[PDB]
Amino acid sequence: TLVKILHHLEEPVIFIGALKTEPQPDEDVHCDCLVAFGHHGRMLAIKASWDESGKLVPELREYCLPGPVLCAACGGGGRVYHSTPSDLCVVDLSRPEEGPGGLPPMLCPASLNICSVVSLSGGTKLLALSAKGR
Amino acid sequence: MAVTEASLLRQCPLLLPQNRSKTVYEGFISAQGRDFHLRIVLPEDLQLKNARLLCSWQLRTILSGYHRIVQQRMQHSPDLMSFMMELKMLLEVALKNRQELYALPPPPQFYSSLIEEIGTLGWDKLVYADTCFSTIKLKAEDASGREHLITLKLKAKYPAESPDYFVDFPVPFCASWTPQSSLISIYSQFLAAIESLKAFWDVMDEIDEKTWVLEPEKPPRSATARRIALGNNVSINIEVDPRHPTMLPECFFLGADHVVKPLGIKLSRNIHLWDPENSVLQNLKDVLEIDFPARA
Amino acid sequence: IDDFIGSGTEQVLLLFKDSLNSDCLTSFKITDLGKINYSSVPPLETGLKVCFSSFRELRQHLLLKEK
Incomplete structure (x- = not known):
């Protein structure tokens, strides 16, 4: 020198x-x-x-995953590591994609500001x- | 009704006007036990060729794949009530398409009742439960001392419809399931079939322990057909009719052509000597008149 | 109180009396008060989590309707 609106999660954006x-x-x-991710726990997938x-056709989800998400990041092979003040949990998108949101902890504590280095x-x-x- | 003074109230009870001139409507719309926020603005005149239709994003996400359709229906349809009937039909159809998406398990019916039922069963029986709590694998014992496993995939409303049972043992497992029925009933039927085959289990356990079974490696209990090796480059595939396990199992030979012909002819000659009282190995060793190699 | 195993979760370490030996930090007892216990349920939790998420969803719907 226009801006496009996609979904509008109702709660703030984090990752x-x-x-x-x-x-x-x-x-x-x-x-x-x-x-993308929310704070109060709304996840979006496309x-x-x-x-x-x-x-x-764009296949959108929208999950409501537990706990106030403080941070998250991505891992190689359709995986996402996110963190709540109780536990550090993980989500597998690798399987159209996924109906319900299943998530285990990793038995690590509340980590804010995660980041990943992929060794391979x-x-x-x-x-x-x-x-x-x- | 014929007129849209009461018909709109009966067909959309949850959508209510804001204005005196019935031009601004706001409120919910219901289809498949879910109220979706909505508002709709006609001009001064009841024309739908240009009528604002504002929604929630939760609803726009679902109507993704029909935006042109509902737009066309707005400009084509005569009346608001007809258009809203069309919109409810479309929301229902779209959700039935995306039925994998919206379902879930009831908190006071599902996660409450299932664990009380597993407590009724016994915590020693459960071996595997998924995080999603969909798959549960149960263990059962025989009087001979073998373990047999059963997969159960549970639906959202578990005792409402039949749960999906994937059981090993070879017969078609006929599980009489009422709504009052629960895991103990299918487990009693599981033990019933296991004990009705305490005979077949002896046969296939003998064939597993004594003979060299080739390619049901680590054989599941589903395998009606067992591939017993005899000699070299030759084998016999015996398909046990598990309703009559001691009955003659339909079998042929695989391998070279010049060695298998005598075996087949001798089987055809000694077929009449098959007694149904002895073990299948005892019958086969006297019919085919040869000893089987043990882990060559 | 700290994570000496190196799992991420904190554990409690208790050092028993010096009358045993005149040597430091012998006779320890490490515990989490859960599973981890050295010395010298997931489905139920997920059900709680899902039920809580549904509860929060109903609260959202409820405030919407009141609005």
Whole structure:
């Protein structure tokens, strides 16, 4: 020198990112999905469907996952690590995508400001900052 | 009714006007036990060719895939009441399409009743429960001392309809399920079939323990057909009719052509000597008149 | 109180009396008061979580209707 409105979650926004669902080493992966998160726990997911009519239709979800989400990040292979003041939990989008939101803890404490380094040398190794300041 | 003074109230009780001139309506609309926020603004005249239709995002998400449809219905449809009937039909159809999306389990009916029923059963029987609490795997014992497992996939309203049972044992498991029925009933039927086959279980356990069974490796109890190896480059696939386990199981040979012909001819000659009292190995060793190799 | 196992969760360490030995931090007792216990249910929790989410959803619907 216009701006487009997509969904409008009613509660504030915390994390926006992307995943590679159906993951059946390189840094930049061609991400199949799109994810955002709320604070009070509203999660959003988008996918390309091209089902039931023979034309491309946007498949949206909207989950209401527990606890006030304080932070989240993405892991290689359609996984998302998010954090609530009780526990650090994880979500698997790899399976159209997922009807109900199933999530285990990782038995780590309330970590705010998570971040991941993908090793792919063993296993995946993330860096967290615990709410106690460690 | 014919007129839209009471017909609109009977067909959309939860949508109520704000203005004297009935132009601004706001409120809910109900389809499949869910009230969805909504408002709709006609101009001064009851024309729908240009009529604002504002919604909630929770509703726009669902109507994704029919926005052009509902737009066309607004400009085509004569009356508000007819249009709202069309809109309720479309919301219902779209949710029935996205029925994997909206369902869930009742908190005071499902997570309450299922655990009380598992307590009725016994905590030693449950081996596996999913995080989603959909899959539960149950264990059952025989009088001989074998474990047999059953998968159960539970629906949202579990005792309302039949739960999906995936049981191993080879017969078609006929599970009489009433609404009053629960896990103990299907487990009593599970033990009933397990004990009706305490005979078949002896046969297939003998074939597993004594003989070299080839490619039901770590055989599930579903396998009606057991591939017993005899000799070299030759095998017999015995399909046990589990209703009559001691009865002759339909069987043929696989391998080379020049060795299997004598085996088949000798089976055809000694078929009449099959007694239904002895073990299947005892019958086969005297019919085919040869000893079987044990883990060659 | 700290995480000495290196799991993430905090544990309590108790050091028993010095009459045992004249050597430091012998005779310990580590416990979480759950499962972890050294020395010298998930479905039910998820059901609680789902029921709480549905409760909060109904509260949202309720305030909407009052509005």
